[PDB]
Amino acid sequence: HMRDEILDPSNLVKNREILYRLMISQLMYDGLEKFAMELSMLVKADQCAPSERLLHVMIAGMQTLS
Amino acid sequence: HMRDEILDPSNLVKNREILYRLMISQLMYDGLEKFAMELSMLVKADQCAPSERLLHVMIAGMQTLS
Numbered sequence: 001h002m003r004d005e006i007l008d009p010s011n012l013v014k015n016r017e018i019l020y021r022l023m024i025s026q027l028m029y030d031g032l033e034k035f036a037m038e039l040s041m042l043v044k045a046d047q048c049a050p051s052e053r054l055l056h057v058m059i060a061g062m063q064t065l066s
Numbered sequence: 067h068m069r070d071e072i073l074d075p076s077n078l079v080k081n082r083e084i085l086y087r088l089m090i091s092q093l094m095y096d097g098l099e100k101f102a103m104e105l106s107m108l109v110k111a112d113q114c115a116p117s118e119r120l121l122h123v124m125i126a127g128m129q130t131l132s
């Protein structure tokens with residue numbers, strides 16, 4: 001489950017896989033199904049559920065980096 | 067410039083606009099130009115430059131939220 005995912009900041013390959021799943025989940029949540037499915041097929045992503053987790057992660061991340 | 071953007075966590079509409087620009091920039095950086103341009107046209111996004119800022123924001127955000 002995406003909710004239980006614990007990051008290793010040094011595994012850039014795994015982190016890019018996680019980012020694309022978060023992007024597919026965000027697109028699904030916002031109703032852009034065809035776009036989300038086309039992206040999933042191109043990057044061979046694992047199954048994603050609709051979620052706006054990426055929006056909340058972005059808000060926390062930008063604050064931490066500022 | 068995306069590099070100078072300062073967040074208001076309470077402006078969810080502006081934050082979703084920022085997220086989609088970060089997503090378009092990430093897709094461009096990773097070489098997925100057609101996908102990035104189709105997304106930009108659907109959401110009427112402001113001009114984006116290729117950048118992997120979203121990946122670094124995600125890594126910081128997930129750590130802060132954990």
Ligand code: NA
Nearest residue numbers: 007008011014
């Ligand atoms: Na990781």
Ligand code: NA
Nearest residue numbers: 008010011014
């Ligand atoms: Na690892």
Ligand code: NA
Nearest residue numbers: 030052055082
């Ligand atoms: Na949203």
Ligand code: NA
Nearest residue numbers: 025026053054
């Ligand atoms: Na998400």
Ligand code: NA
Nearest residue numbers: 073074077080
């Ligand atoms: Na803002």
Ligand code: NA
Nearest residue numbers: 074076077080
């Ligand atoms: Na504001």
Ligand code: NA
Nearest residue numbers: 016096118121
């Ligand atoms: Na990247």
Ligand code: NA
Nearest residue numbers: 091092119120
């Ligand atoms: Na980006």
